[PDB]
Design a protein around this nucleic acid. Structure first.
Ligand SMILES: [Zn+2]
Lengths: 101, 69, 50, 114, 89
RNA sequence: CCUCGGCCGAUCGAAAGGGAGUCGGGUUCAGAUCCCCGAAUCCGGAGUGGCGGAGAUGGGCGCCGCGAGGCGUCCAGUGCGGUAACGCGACCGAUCCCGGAGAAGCCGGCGGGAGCCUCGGGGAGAGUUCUCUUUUCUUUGUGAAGGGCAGGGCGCCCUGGAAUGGGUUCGCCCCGAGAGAGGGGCCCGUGCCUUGGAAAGCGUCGCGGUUCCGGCGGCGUCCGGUGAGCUCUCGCUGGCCCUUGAAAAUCCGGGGGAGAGGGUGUAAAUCUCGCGCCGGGCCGUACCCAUAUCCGCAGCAGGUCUCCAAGGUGAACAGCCUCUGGCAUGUUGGAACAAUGUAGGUAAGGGAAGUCGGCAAGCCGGAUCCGUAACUUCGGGAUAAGGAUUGGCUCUAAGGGCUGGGCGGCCGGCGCCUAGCAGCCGACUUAGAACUGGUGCGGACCAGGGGAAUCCGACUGUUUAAUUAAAACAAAGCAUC
RNA sequence: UCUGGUGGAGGUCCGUAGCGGUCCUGACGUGCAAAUCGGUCGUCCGACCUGGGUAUAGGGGCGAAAGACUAAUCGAACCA
């Protein structure tokens, strides 16, 4: 009854334009459980990273479109919406890809 | 379209000289055997894969068989 | 209108076929006096007897 | 909101231009032209206000492609008279015939004795 | 609700007081439901002028224009019974 | 040749009346419920039976057969079930007769269903991110025809016998001519599931060949809640009428029983049952449908019959702003901002002194709470007249629905829901209060000035299309011939 | 008899669409128009508005009556 959602940042980190560690702290700080930011909702939601693959797990109702809202805000803050887009490559994962010609 | 709930009735419909083709479709939950006749398309819904493979072997000879893959 | 009889349609067919310009070789015929089709009918300008 | 158009050349809201809304497998809303509502037979008695039971309420010309059982009730005067008035005519026929025999016997006995 | 206008309050001031008074009597009788003499139920309404219907026994009777029984009808029925009885006895 | 036999008379008359039967997906530069794909359906024909099923295959007397089951004879059989309402797949039948459907007004009020709008979440894509917003926008299917189940309706049936009258609607209305209660029956079923059906359509992410392959592939097309909401439609029940709101083709049911069938075969006549075979000819179909395809001499501010109808404000299909869709300002542009004009405003102090005349303009205007005269045909006059309030914000009180009542059950005294308690769910208002702004608040939009009298016509209605809308005409009532 | 509800009548009132056409004697008046335009107005469940089909033809028709209308023509149309 737990929800596992993942985020792929392989391409941006290979190019060096993205910091995976900076993403962890952004999602750790600017994330809400029951409308309150910080503290990860008393530890109910957790974030892990492994090789630029940020996984978010929770047991309370948690929607991955909320994460797409958060990653878009991260990209805009870092001036990356002009080269990167967030695409659902699976049922439970998003992936950061470039714009083709 | 008519829904047939018996295998014995399906074999009778398939062996009709009116019958033209048997179309087998595989879904996530069932397999549907469809026999096209002059007036109605007779569909048989089978939820067991073991019985589904048996029906393919017992289909009458000569009748066209198409797999909707 | 779209709803029309066979008699009316055949009448409109004939007026359509006779609304053509004069052929060019007619001017070259010996003793020719026709310079243009003086019976040309435009749909917006002149209406049919029907 | 998607707006609709007539599928036929009749542009007037007549009794034969009635339509309903149907959603297609193409996720479009279209007009479907509906048949008129049929009425079940009214009893031949002339006093019962309600319709007959057991008979399909369809338009008259469709009535000829139904089976006979859908058009009648298994009883004398089945699909033409109600049960209540069929009962009354059985009793009315019997009781009047009984009175006629009584009257004939009474007039025959009176004639013989007078 | 009203002092005297009764059922002809629907006409307001639009006709004379005397004309509204005359039609008041007729409109009460033409819309009243009478007791049916055949079934005993008080359901004898008026279909049209001279036509009276009972909604329980489904009997239609020819009556008066606004009242179920006209006085001329009652006198004639009683007179015909007298003339018939004189013929018989 | 007998028998039957009323045409109660030819024929014409509706592309809005009646009138069997088709709907999804794709396809064009322009066609399409018409072409292709798919799934259906009506009518007509089938003689020389197209195949099944039904009719229709029982009983008695014996004999043999261990007995089952067979041999002979005789007699049935134009189906069957339910107390009933009626039901089942068919379930013979002519002249003749009866009936039904086609086939009925307008208005009101309720209820059911659908479409649309709305609200809470979950996906996919997009917009914004200067700060916030877990946000804002889009999208989130299942045709006809069958089968099943909800749901709606019923003056349909059976038991039974009601006053201490009861049942019940928003209103009514119903009952010893049979209420309430219980149990059934029928009709409609445009709703849901299902066959059709996901293979197709749409969304999104990729991979191909080449101008097109309905290319190929992955994932999805989800779960709920509301309502006097609007529209359509199906019902129920009322009101009005000195107004009672088509006809005929066509189809069906019933009454009767003239006839037909076969003698016990594995049979007959017959069959409105299931499937199978063949056909459906003729004409119309493009497009405009109007501030540019029609009429007005024209691309003419005129005229010309309909259908569908989103968000916000608000009583509203009012006016004002917006979305889907559409457009280019209405047969030209540039510059300037004179007089006179057309259209729209404002004005100190007076306040009709103007003028034939308050013409024109202006005042009033919504809603809530108070308060309303003379006169009167007692209905009205009446929004008479006159007065107060109206914003924003933060609260308070009241107004409802469902479920429950001493691993899973239950044979049980052992429990007692009873000043209606607990939990869960939910929308729209009303009233009161505090605070607050340069007293501003129906802030735009929408939106009656009023009173005292005289003349005429009673009122509503009508009239000189293109100078007269009136006191003229009509009208109900009265009277006369 | 009075009171509070319910109910939803009416050639009922305000007022949209529709139908009509008061006043400005406004605009225009070689017009957009051989009768139109704007504001303001009357009515808006009824003696209501409207399409198609039908019937009545010129000393005739039709007229809730103005000598009105009868194809821009009416105190007897138009055509020869
Ligand atoms: Zn009666």
């Amino acid at each position: 009854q737990v929800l596992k959602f993942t985020l792929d940042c392989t391409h941006p980190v290979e190019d060096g334009i993205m910091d995976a560690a900076n993403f962890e702290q952004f999602l750790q700080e600017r994330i809400k459980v029951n409308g309150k930011a910080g503290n990860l909702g008393g530890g109910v939601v957790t974030i892990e990273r492994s090789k630029s693959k940020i996984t978010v797990t929770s047991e309370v109702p948690f929607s991955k479109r909320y994460l797409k809202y958060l990653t878009k805000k991260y990209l805009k803050k870092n001036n990356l919406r002009d080269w990167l887009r967030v695409v659902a490559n699976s049922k439970e994962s998003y992936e950061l890809r470039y714009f083709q010609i | 379209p008519r829904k047939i709930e018996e295998i014995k009735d399906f074999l009778l419909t398939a062996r009709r000289k009116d019958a033209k083709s048997v179309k087998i479709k595989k879904n996530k939950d069932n397999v549907k055997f469809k026999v096209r006749c002059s007036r109605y398309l007779y569909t048989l819904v089978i939820t067991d894969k073991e019985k589904a493979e048996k029906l393919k072997q017992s289909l009458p000879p000569g009748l066209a068989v198409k797999d909707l893959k | 209108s779209s709803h029309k009889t066979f008699r009316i349609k055949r009448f409109l067919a004939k007026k359509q076929k006779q609304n053509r310009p004069i052929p060019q070789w007619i001017r070259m015929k010996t003793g020719n006096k026709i310079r243009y089709n003086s019976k040309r009918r435009h749909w917006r300008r002149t209406k049919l007897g029907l | 909101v998607q707006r609709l158009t007539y599928r036929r050349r009749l542009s007037y809201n007549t009794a034969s231009n009635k339509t309903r809304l149907s959603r297609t497998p193409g996720n479009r809303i279209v007009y479907l032209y509906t048949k008129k509502v049929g009425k079940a037979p009214k009893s031949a008695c002339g006093v019962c206000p309600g319709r007959l039971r057991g008979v399909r309420a369809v338009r008259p010309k469709v009535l000829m492609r139904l089976s006979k059982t859908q058009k009648h009730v298994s009883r004398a005067y089945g699909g033409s008279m109600c049960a209540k008035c069929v009962r009354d005519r059985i009793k009315r026929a019997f009781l009047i015939e009984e009175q006629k025999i009584v009257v004939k016997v009474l007039k025959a006995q009176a004639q013989s004795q007078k | 609700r009203t002092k005297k206008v009764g059922i002809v309050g629907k006409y307001g001031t639009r006709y004379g007081a005397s004309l509204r008074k005359m039609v008041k009597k007729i409109e009460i009788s033409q819309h009243a439901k009478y007791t049916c003499s055949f079934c005993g139920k008080t359901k004898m309404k008026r279909r049209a002028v001279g036509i009276w219907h009972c909604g329980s026994c489904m009997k239609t009777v020819a009556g008066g224009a606004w009242t179920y029984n006209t006085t001329s009808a009652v006198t004639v029925k009683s007179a015909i019974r007298r003339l018939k009885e004189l013929k018989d006895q």
